[PDB]
Amino acid sequence: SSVDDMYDFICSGPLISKIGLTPEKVAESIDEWIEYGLRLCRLFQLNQLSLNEAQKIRIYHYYIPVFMWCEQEISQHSSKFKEEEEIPPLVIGFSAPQGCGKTTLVFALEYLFKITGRKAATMSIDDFYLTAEEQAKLRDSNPGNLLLEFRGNAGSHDLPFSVETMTALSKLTKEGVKVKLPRYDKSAYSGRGDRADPSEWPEVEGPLPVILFEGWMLGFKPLPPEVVKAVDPQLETINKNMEAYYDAWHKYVKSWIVIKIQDPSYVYQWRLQAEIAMRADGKPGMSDEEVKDFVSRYMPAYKAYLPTLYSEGPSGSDPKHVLLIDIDEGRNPILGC
């Protein structure tokens, strides 16, 4: 794979048309492309010279174009202020379902921002879950609603904490000003989970320009209860909760990326394979029925709310500031325009 070849490969990606880039721009920044490819190959210990098609597709059709788009969004963000005018952090929200490269993407995205001189901070929505006692009390309020027994569906999120955490992130415009990133431990209490103790949390200094905000439920909007009741009775409370999520997250996210999957059932598949790989290699792996329950409990929310994203779009979104990445069954960007 010579420089020229890679150029061609880059130009055939499904996202070149979609980030606003052109063959001349690719030719003029091919040095940046190849250096970013080197950095991502080392970030995964890949070979550059010995990449199979999946690795090349991730690096040059999936990761780097998204990094380019995000950096352009921060560029147009910071172009709107003057000298000595402090720049608020830009929060880019990633609305993608579970286990679709969403998580490892942001790990790759965050890394390139660090390399290219923009301090980056990552926060999953799961880090704002109700603590174990608060989660238990939320369950107790709805003893007949399974989906609220455990995490993820609307209600299991500590919204006042989320609002304070998002507000404090914004005031990182000078140096010295800090904010601790609330980490959430998912294995606490036999695997149920509790917030990581606040004295174990990573902390970010200075002025931070970009914030990466991911979650399986971002962009999901309040629907009329008539779509809700028929998909699942146990969503109607979960529907009424997300009406209060319109205001704690959608206000704060400016730029958006929506990994859009083909059929929601993939989630189950993607989970099982992973656990199967664990069980094949002989590692802690959830049983088939365990995984089935786990996924089949978030599925009631997916089938309710994923249709809305593809139809209209995320709630607190601006159409020119939302990127749509259609991924195939191998989590690779589809050339679906």
Partner: protein, 71 residues
């Protein structure tokens, strides 16, 4: 958008018309850079006399590559 690529590959020959335009060309692709570009260009469809002039220029670039990064 194929002639973006044909224009890229011919304009790559104009980019190599100088001895002082080699340095960042010649880290990768190889000494055979313009030879493989000519392969892709023949496959894209190019005339035979342009092919002859190219097949001369690409060989010249191969010599100017071996001149600095040969054994």
């Amino acid at each position: 958008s194929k002639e973006a690529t044909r224009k890229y590959y011919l304009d790559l020959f104009k980019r190599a018309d100088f001895t002082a335009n080699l340095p960042k060309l010649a880290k990768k692709g190889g000494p055979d850079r313009l030879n493989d570009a000519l392969k892709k260009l023949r496959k894209a469809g190019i005339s035979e006399e342009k092919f002859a002039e190219l097949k001369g220029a690409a060989a010249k670039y191969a010599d100017d590559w071996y001149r600095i990064y040969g054994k």
